[PDB]
Design a binder for this molecule. Structure first.
Ligand SMILES: C[C@@H]1O[C@H](O)[C@H](O)[C@H](O)[C@H]1O
Ligand SMILES: C[C@@H]1O[C@H](O)[C@H](O)[C@H](O)[C@H]1O
Ligand SMILES: C[C@@H]1O[C@H](O)[C@H](O)[C@H](O)[C@H]1O
Ligand SMILES: C[C@@H]1O[C@H](O)[C@H](O)[C@H](O)[C@H]1O
Ligand SMILES: [Cl-]
Ligand SMILES: [Cl-]
Ligand SMILES: [Cl-]
Ligand SMILES: [Cl-]
Ligand SMILES: [Cl-]
Ligand SMILES: [Cl-]
Ligand code: NA
Ligand code: NA
Ligand code: NA
Ligand code: NA
Ligand code: NA
Ligand code: NA
Ligand code: NA
Ligand code: NA
Lengths: 341, 341
C-alpha cells in the first residue's frame, strides 16, 4: 500500500490555462478548464471525455501543444485520447494494448516522441513510445525489468535523458535512466535506498538537477537529489503527512511541497529567499481533504492547489500577495481510481 | 539601415546560468558565464571560442541542453560551434556552407531539429535544418523567397509551427509560417503593414500568442500581436528610442520592453498588474550605452539587462525588490558585427 493518492491530473495548456482530469462514480474521465489564463479564472465546470478507466487518468502536453490523456481501461490495456488540433476537439479513446498494473507515467523525449511507462502483470516496468514526434503509430511494448511496488514516475535530465523512479520490493526508492536522449538504451536498475510509504514525486530544479520527494517510514516528508556524480543522502523535511506529497516550482524557482496533515487539512513547506534556500517550517492552508493535494503554477506565476473535499467535490486554493485564498469548490464527485493503493 | 543592434546573444543554460556571446576587435566570438544560477552571480570573465565572424554570433540551446552558436564566417558561409556534451567542452567551428547576408535566426522544431534562417545573396530568406533531433548532418539549403531589408527573427506558435518575421523593401513587417509543425511546407509571405526602423523582436505571450515589437517611422516603440484568426493593428507604446528594442517576460509573464533613449540611457516600459495588463509610462535605468540592450530572465525569475558602455565594455543591471541594481561592468571590448546595420 501507499499514502493516499492525488485525485486529479493537471496541465498548463498551450494558451496558459489550467485543465484538470479526474474520474467520476461512472468510471468516466471528467475534465475542468480555466476560461482565462489567470489566477481566480472562472471554470468550465465538469464535462465528460467518457471512457471506462481502472487507473488515475494522466494528461501530458505534446510538443505541438496537443493534450493527450492516458488511462488503464477495464481490459487492463493502456488507452489514450488526444486533441486532434491544439485546444480544439478530442479523438475517440483508442487502445495501445498491453496489460498494465499501474497508473501510466509519461514524458516527451528531446525528439518530441512521447514515451509511456507502466507496471506490467510480471510487476516489471514496461514502456511504449510514439514512433515520430507528437504522433502515432506507437512502438511495440517492451520491459525495462525490475520489480516495483508503487506507481512509477518519469522525468527528463538537463541533458535530455529520461529517468524513471519507483518503489521496490524492499520499499527503497529504485531508478533507471536512458544512457542517451531519445534512446532504447537504459541503465541497470539502481537503489537510492531509504524506506518510502508514498509514490515518489520527481521535479527538475532551477539548476537542472532531479529531486525526488516521498513519505518515509516515520510518515515525515523525505527528499534526495542529484549532485555525472552521485545522489545526496535522504534528508527529512519533517512534518507528519497522511497523503502523497505534491511539489511545484514558484515562478522564482523556489520548490514548495504540499500534503494532507494528521488534522486532514492541507500543509505546505517551501524553500525561502531563493531556489538555493533553506526550507520553511510546515504551515496550514486549512480545509478538510480526502485526497493528496495537486499543485501547479498558473500563467500569473502563482501556485494553485486542488484536493477532494469531504463532499467529494474538487476544492481549490491559490497564492495571494500576503497569504492564500479561502478554499472554493469546483463541484463534481471524484473517486480515487489509482491502479495502486 | 536599422536602429542600433544588440551587441550580445544570451541564453539560460540547462543548469540555469546566464551565458553571453559577443565579438571582439579580433572578430573572434567571446563568451562570459555566470558561475551560479542566481542574480548577482560572479562571472567567468571573457574567454575566446575563436573563429572569425562577419555577423552577430547567435547562441541557441538544443533540446538535449547543448549550446550551439551560429555566425557568418569571413567567406559569408554559415558557421557553427557546439558543446560536445551538456555544459562541457566545445567542438571546432565547422561550415554549413551557403552564402548569407544577415545574422542567423534559430529555433528548434517540435521534433528537436534546429532550423536556421538567414538572408541570401538574392536578398530572399534561406533555411537549413538538422536532419535528426539535436544532431547533424544538416539538410541542403533552400529558399523561402521574399525580399528582406532587416535581420530575420523566428519563433514558434503555440501549435508548434515556426514563423519568421523580417522587414520588406516597402519597410513594412512581413512574415511567413510553417503550415504544419516540423514541416518543409510554408505559407506565402504576408504583410503586417506598418513602417519599421529596427529589426523586429518576437516573443510568445503567457496565452501562446506571438507579439512583435519594432521601432516605427516616428522612432516610438510599436507592437502588433496574434488574436486561426488575424493580427491586431499596430499600436504605439510611445517613447523615443535610439536603438533596437529588447523584450523579455517577468516570471509572472508580464512583458517588459527595453531600449536606448535620446539621452543614451536605458529606458523600459512594462505591463502592470498581470500579463493582460496595461503598459507603464517609460522610466530610466540610467547608464550611458553604445548598443541596444539585451534582456533575459535569470533562474531567480529576475530580469537582467546587458548593454555596451562608453568604454566598449559590457555592463549589467538587474531587478531588485524595490528598483534595479546600479550598472556594473563585466569588462571586455565588444564590437557590433551585425551583418545588417
Ligand atoms: C548524474 C547521473 O544521472 C543519472 O541519470 C542517474 O540519476 C545517476 O544516478 C546519476 O549519477
Ligand atoms: C507568496 C508566498 O509564497 C510562498 O512560497 C508560500 O506559498 C507562502 O505561503 C506565500 O505567502
Ligand atoms: C493564427 C495564424 O497564425 C499564423 O502562424 C500567422 O501568424 C497568421 O497570420 C495567423 O492568422
Ligand atoms: C520589480 C519591478 O519589475 C517591473 O517589471 C519593472 O522592471 C520595475 O522596474 C521593477 O521595480
Ligand atoms: Cl466569471
Ligand atoms: Cl536491471
Ligand atoms: Cl496515513
Ligand atoms: Cl564572488
Ligand atoms: Cl511568397
Ligand atoms: Cl536613432
Ligand atoms: Na529523451
Ligand atoms: Na513526471
Ligand atoms: Na538532471
Ligand atoms: Na461543493
Ligand atoms: Na516545428
Ligand atoms: Na527568435
Ligand atoms: Na501562437
Ligand atoms: Na569597464
Amino acid at each position: 500500500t501507499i499514502a493516499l493518492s492525488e485525485i486529479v491530473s493537471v496541465v498548463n495548456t498551450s494558451d496558459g490555462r489550467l485543465e484538470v482530469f479526474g474520474v467520476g462514480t461512472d468510471k468516466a474521465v471528467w475534465h475542468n478548464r480555466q476560461m482565462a489564463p489567470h489566477t481566480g479564472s472562472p471554470w468550465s465546470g465538469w464535462s465528460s471525455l467518457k471512457g471506462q478507466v481502472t487507473s488515475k487518468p494522466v494528461v501530458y502536453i505534446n510538443t505541438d501543444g496537443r493534450l493527450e490523456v492516458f488511462a488503464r481501461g477495464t481490459d487492463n490495456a493502456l488507452w489514450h485520447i488526444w486533441q486532434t488540433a491544439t485546444n480544439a476537439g478530442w479523438s475517440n479513446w483508442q487502445s495501445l494494448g498491453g496489460v498494465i498494473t499501474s497508473n501510466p507515467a509519461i514524458y516527451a523525449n528531446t525528439d518530441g516522441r512521447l514515451e509511456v511507462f507502466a507496471r506490467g502483470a510480471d510487476n516489471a516496468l514496461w514502456h511504449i513510445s510514439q514512433t515520430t514526434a507528437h504522433s502515432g503509430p506507437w512502438s511495440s511494448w517492451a520491459s525495462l525489468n525490475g520489480v516495483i511496488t508503487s506507481n512509477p514516475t518519469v522525468h527528463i535530465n538537463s541533458d535530455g535523458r529520461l529517468e524513471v523512479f519507483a518503489r521496490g520490493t524492499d520499499n527503497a526508492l529504485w531508478h533507471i535512466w536512458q544512457t542517451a536522449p531519445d534512446s532504447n538504451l537504459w541503465s541497470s536498475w539502481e537503489s537510492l535506498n531509504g524506506i518510502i510509504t508514498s509514490d515518489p514525486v520527481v521535479i527538475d530544479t532551477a539548476d537542472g538537477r532531479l529531486e525526488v520527494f516521498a513519505r518515509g517510514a516515520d510518515n515525515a516528508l523525505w527528499h534526495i537529489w542529484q549532485t555525472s556524480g552521485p545522489w545526496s543522502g535522504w534528508q527529512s523535511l519533517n512534518g507528519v503527512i497522511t497523503s502523497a506529497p505534491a511539489v511545484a516550482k514558484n515562478c522564482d524557482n523556489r520548490l514548495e511541497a504540499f500534503a494532507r496533515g494528521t488534522d486532514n487539512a492541507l500543509w505546505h513547506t517551501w524553500q525561502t529567499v531563493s531556489h538555493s534556500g533553506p526550507w520553511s517550517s510546515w504551515q496550514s492552508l486549512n480545509g478538510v481533504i480526502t485526497s493528496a493535494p495537486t499543485a501547479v503554477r498558473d500563467a500569473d506565476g502563482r501556485l494553485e492547489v486542488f484536493a477532494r473535499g469531504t463532499d467529494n467535490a474538487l476544492w481549490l486554493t491559490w497564492q495571494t500577495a500576503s497569504s492564500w485564498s479561502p478554499w472554493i469548490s469546483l463541484g463534481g464527485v471524484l473517486i480515487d481510481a489509482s491502479a495502486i493503493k
